[PDB]
Design a protein around this nucleic acid. Structure first.
Ligand SMILES: [Zn+2]
Lengths: 207, 59, 145, 176, 38
RNA sequence: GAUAAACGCUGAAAGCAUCUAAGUGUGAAGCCCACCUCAAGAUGAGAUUUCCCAUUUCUUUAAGAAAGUAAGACCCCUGAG
RNA sequence: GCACCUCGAUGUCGGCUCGUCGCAUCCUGGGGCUGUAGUCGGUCCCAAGGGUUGGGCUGUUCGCCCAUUAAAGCGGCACGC
């Protein structure tokens, strides 16, 4: 249903109208071009392709321009979809402004996490240390690989491999302001994402 | 050769052992190689032997 | 070394057969179908070459399960992860994925060579009553088996 | 099959339609349809009905008795109709009617409302007695069972919904 | 219920009832006699 | 949504009785969905949108070789979310 | 108990890290009976989804004790590693 992508700016504080400090993320948008309409007779779906930014025209290909040319806009970076929306109300080339989330206030936020390289088996999974003194030699290691009898290692004995870089929703957040002149939604809480990354913002599922 | 005799005998409505018993009642002593390649190639000869084996145990 | 036929790859013509499944049990349908695909009922074997045929199956759905086994023949899958046994099916596969019944109880009936793979991709199993394959002019068998 | 050798007489206004498994009984109130097995030979002959069948099966005799008993259910339900009657003891329990809903206040902190299908009426004269009428036996029994299950009785004071005549046998509780 | 591998009618009014591959004994007299091979 | 133990409605075999053989329901932190993620190397390798249009010699035309290209990509360079 | 198995060498108990499986079930969940008025209970049937604590005393297994908690389960995995 209500779906808007956008950037990620930073973290602020906003007094509410009873005088209470609340931490607030700052999420932008722009006008938002619908690119395709996917129906059951063509794809077996009901979905809508949307796209948010302005590239330079050096930085694209002819097929990107052949997508864009049915909506008469600039070629764009990010292209995603949205499923399970009662369509009507949507043509090739409309704009989905920031106004859709006035006080909807029950919203799922998705991003992609940061990236932290190779790290030890503690910092992923929270497995604890061994004793740092009384003569031991077992400071920061990932345990024992299992029993003896099966003559192998069972799957999922988790070990050292790269931290972060997958997409994570956070459910049921509120919305505070909508600044139509500046295209900014303000949200309570914390969002998985580094700065300048994408964020999808949808109406929540669990009512 | 038994498997090929199986298929070609089943084509003429005979199971794969009643040929054996009928051809020994008709007192015929063909090796299983020779019935195999006649069963592949000569349809007329294999149906002729099939009809005499039909006639043999028909008593 | 002397004279018996060893057929080549492009010597034996193939055909297309149509088999119903209205109220016949699984074992006997699968037995006749799996004896078709190796190249039996044709006097020109090799144990090398696909001398078999093509088999299309109509009305998967209406296959019997005799007596009980409507709720009893539990299939099992394990997922190579600890505790991962999934006995998710029963005789429920009559209702949903009735393709998936005959594609298991025929794959068991075949050898497990590479010919037990090239002889498996000649099945086509449809739960309904429609040929999408009418371009190839298939014939009809009669099962008194 | 002594029960499978009934003397069945059709009541005034009742016909028969035979189309395969269905046999329809239509009369002054209802038009019920069921299905019956093919080891059954139907019959002829206005208003007296019997069921002679190709007999000597294995268990020999279940089909006669059950069929049906089911035809007498058909005949009595289409011609006459059935009843099951309930009560309410356990002081302060109410039963009030707004059409096809039954507001039961059985002593919880919430009322209970039971709906109805098409061919089922209700009659509530007082604050205690609910009488369910209808056409089948199965449907009347299921609705009566659903009403009793809200609060079946207890063996100390005998609260809850009853029949007209349950033998709710009663124990004793000490005062401590 | 009483779940015992051997099952006997306790009272006069007991009746022996098969409901599955399963042997039941049920009184209307006492509820104490609901038995079952199990 | 379909079950487990437990409870029924109707009903006979057995003129009665009875939850079952025929028929027909209720019923759990459990099973399958519902929530989050990976996923067509699913060799059964899926679907949609948009972009691109031809020289030589013969081995003789066979899904032949070889060389320039298109759409596009890569190398090389300044870098970090 | 026996002595098949390993003497050109198959390293014991507890504790730490890490778990996983079975159910003859400790809590939570659904039930039948009661010598069940109520809140409490006793016994038996279904059920493995998750959870199942910190300290004092010897090297401890085992156990005694303090203070908590819905509960402070029994066992297999070379008496797991
Ligand atoms: Zn008794």
């Amino acid at each position: 249903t209500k779906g808007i992508l956008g950037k990620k700016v930073g973290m602020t504080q906003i007094f509410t109208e009873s005088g209470e400090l609340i931490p607030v993320t700052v999420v932008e948008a722009t006008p938002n071009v619908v690119l395709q309409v996917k129906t059951v007779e063509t794809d077996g779906y009901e979905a809508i392709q949307v796209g948010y930014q302005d590239k330079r025209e050096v930085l694209s290909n002819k097929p990107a321009k052949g997508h864009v040319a049915k909506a008469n806009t600039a070629p764009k970076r990010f292209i995603k979809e949205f499923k399970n929306v009662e369509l009507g109300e949507y043509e090739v080339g409309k704009e989905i402004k920031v106004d859709v989330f006035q006080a909807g206030d029950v919203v799922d936020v998705t991003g992609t996490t940061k990236g932290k390289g190779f790290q030890g088996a503690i910092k992923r999974h929270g497995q604890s240390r061994g004793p740092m003194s009384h003569g031991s030699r077992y400071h920061r290691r990932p345990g024992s690989m299992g029993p003896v009898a099966p003559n192998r290692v069972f799957k999922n004995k988790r070990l050292a491999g790269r931290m972060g870089g997958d997409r994570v929703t956070i459910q049921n957040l509120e919305v505070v302001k909508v600044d139509v002149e500046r295209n900014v939604i303000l949200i309570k809480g914390n969002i998985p994402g580094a700065k300048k990354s994408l964020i999808t913002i949808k109406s929540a599922v669990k009512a | 050769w038994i498997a090929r005799i199986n298929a070609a005998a089943r084509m003429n409505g005979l199971s794969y052992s009643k040929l054996m018993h009928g051809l020994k009642l008709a007192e015929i002593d063909i090796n299983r190689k020779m019935l195999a390649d006649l069963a592949v190639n000569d349809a007329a000869a294999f149906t002729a032997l099939a009809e005499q084996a039909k006639d043999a145990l028909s008593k | 070394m002397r004279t018996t036929y060893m057929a080549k790859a492009g010597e034996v013509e193939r055909k297309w057969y149509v088999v119903d499944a209205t109220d016949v049990p699984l074992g006997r349908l699968s037995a006749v179908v799996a004896s078709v695909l190796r190249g039996k009922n044709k006097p020109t074997f090799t144990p090398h070459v696909d001398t078999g045929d093509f088999v299309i199956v109509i009305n998967a759905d209406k296959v019997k399960l005799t007596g009980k086994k409507a709720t009893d023949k539990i299939y099992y899958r394990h997922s190579m992860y600890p505790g991962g046994l999934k006995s998710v099916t029963a005789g429920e596969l009559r209702d949903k994925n009735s393709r998936r019944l005959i594609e298991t109880s025929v794959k068991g009936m075949l050898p497990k060579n590479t010919l037990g793979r090239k002889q498996f991709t000649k099945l086509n199993v449809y739960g309904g009553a429609e040929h999408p394959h009418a371009a190839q002019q298939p014939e009809v068998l009669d099962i008194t088996n | 099959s002594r029960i499978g050798n009934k003397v069945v007489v059709l009541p005034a206004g009742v016909e028969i339609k035979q189309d395969g498994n269905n046999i329809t009984v239509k009369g002054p109130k209802g038009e019920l349809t069921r299905e019956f097995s093919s080891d059954i030979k139907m019959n002829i002959e206005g208003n007296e009905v019997t069921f002679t069948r190709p007999n000597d099966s294995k268990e020999m005799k279940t089909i006669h008795g059950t069929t049906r008993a089911n035809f007498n259910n058909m005949v009595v339900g289409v011609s006459e109709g059935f009843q099951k009657a309930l009560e309410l003891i356990g002081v302060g329990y109410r039963a009030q009617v707004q059409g096809n809903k039954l507001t039961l206040n059985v002593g919880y902190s919430h009322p209970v409302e039971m709906t109805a299908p098409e061919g089922v009426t209700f009659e509530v004269p007082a604050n205690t007695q609910v009488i369910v009428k209808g056409i089948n036996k199965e449907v009347v029994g299921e609705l009566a069972a659903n009403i009793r299950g809200v609060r079946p009785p207890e063996p100390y004071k005998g609260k809850g919904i009853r029949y007209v005549g349950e033998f709710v046998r009663r124990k004793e509780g000490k005062t401590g | 219920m009483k779940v015992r591998p051997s099952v006997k009618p306790m009272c006069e009014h007991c009746k022996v009832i098969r409901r599955k591959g399963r042997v039941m004994v049920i009184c209307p007299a006492n509820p104490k006699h609901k038995q079952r091979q199990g």
